[PDB]
């Protein structure tokens, strides 16, 4: 298939591991009563466990010889064989939120450098301004590419460089 494995639906090792986990869980379940909160929690665990196995089988995951899911990190390969939801979509999601955090922080820094005491507003957060900027950047990438294309993203060579060379 994809580098010599099989999907988990017909994977023999998958069902064996599933049976093993259910077995240990029922083994813990045996010694209590039928109304006890221990048995309530144990049956909740059974339900969550079997639901987890069904969810991993449903999403078309790929298992090796240990019966464990394997993720594929390759744009062409994952997009071709239907696996965009394990690395590709997660990486674009994370890059969105991480750039969002960074951009909000940077806008705060420039917003507070223009005052009379930049250190006080760094140690004592300007909460109205911080919430305001916390909203104002939900679309950051557009503002980022605009700041890039206007040449305000980068300071020129008035940065302090080490002396001497």
């Amino acid at each position: 298939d994809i580098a010599g494995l099989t999907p988990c639906s017909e994977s023999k090792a998958y069902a064996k591991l599933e049976k093993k986990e259910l077995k240990t869980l029922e083994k813990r379940l045996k010694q209590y009563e039928a109304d006890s909160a221990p048995a309530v929690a144990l049956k909740a665990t059974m339900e969550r466990t079997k639901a987890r196995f069904a969810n991993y089988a449903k999403a078309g995951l790929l298992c090796g010889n240990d019966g464990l899911p394997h993720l594929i990190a390759d744009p062409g390969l994952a997009l071709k064989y239907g696996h965009a939801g394990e690395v590709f979509i997660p990486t674009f999601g994370f890059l969105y939120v991480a750039g969002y955090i960074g951009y909000v922080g940077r806008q705060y820094l420039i917003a507070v450098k223009g005052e009379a005491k930049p250190t006080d507003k760094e140690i004592i957060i300007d909460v109205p301004l911080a919430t305001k900027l916390a909203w104002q950047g939900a679309g950051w990438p557009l503002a980022a590419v605009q700041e890039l294309q206007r040449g305000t993203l980068l300071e020129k060579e008035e940065n302090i460089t080490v002396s001497p060379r």
């Binding site: 909203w135 104002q136 950047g137 939900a138 679309g139 557009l142 503002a143 605009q146 206007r150």
Partner: protein, 217 residues
């Protein structure tokens, strides 16, 4: 002036002679994207193109969608129009996509170079002779000449109203297409049938009942 939120402080970049001279200004910029006038220029172009192609697409969904509930125009559902079309057609979808990539890339390149330079495409000898009528009309995004054949764009008294109707219908059209997508993934039938099934029983059939659009209730 009108505002989206009466009593809200309209931002200072949407309050200029340059920004109030735009079609459909309602001071709506909660996320302050348009702080750069060049960026506002480009974004206005984006809004205009999205408006025009949104109207075209949504009209293509609706009008065959409506008229098929009458006798004529047996049209399949919009989410199945491609398949049937390609079974009706003569070529595989790859070659069609390639040809449309070429024929659309040429035109979009034209328009793009007109965005970067306003009086660009009209300079002598470039085309075989349409260089005569490929300049702008002093307002970027609204060319003249072979566009607007009927001469409706000549009178100065209806100008802002034609503009404003365009932008309002376009915004409504974009909302309509997003609605088409969500109704496709939510209920699982054509938009006309959603309209019929909602008029038939309003207080029972809406997005509070479809069981996907809000699962916590």
């Amino acid at each position: 002036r009108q505002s989206w939120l009466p009593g809200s402080q309209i931002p200072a970049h949407l309050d200029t002679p340059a920004a109030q001279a735009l079609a459909g200004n309602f001071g709506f910029d909660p996320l302050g994207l348009g702080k750069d006038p060049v960026a506002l220029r480009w974004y206005q172009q984006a809004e205009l193109i999205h408006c025009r192609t949104a109207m075209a697409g949504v009209a293509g969904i609706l009008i065959p969608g409506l008229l098929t509930k009458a006798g004529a125009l047996n049209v399949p559902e919009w989410y199945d129009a491609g398949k049937v079309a390609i079974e009706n057609s003569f070529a595989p979808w790859g070659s069609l996509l390639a040809v449309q990539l070429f024929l659309c890339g040429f035109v979009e390149a034209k328009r793009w170079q007109d965005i970067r330079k306003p009086g660009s495409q009209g300079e002598p000898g470039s085309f075989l002779g349409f260089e005569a009528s490929l300049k702008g009309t002093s307002e970027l995004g609204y060319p003249g000449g072979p566009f607007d054949p009927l001469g409706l764009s000549k009178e100065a008294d209806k100008w802002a109203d034609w503009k404003l109707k365009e932008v309002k219908n376009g915004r409504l059209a974009m909302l309509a297409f997003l609605g088409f997508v969500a109704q496709k993934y939510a209920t699982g039938a054509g938009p006309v049938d959603n309209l019929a099934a909602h008029l038939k029983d309003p207080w029972h059939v809406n997005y509070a009942t479809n069981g996907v659009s809000l699962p916590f209730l």
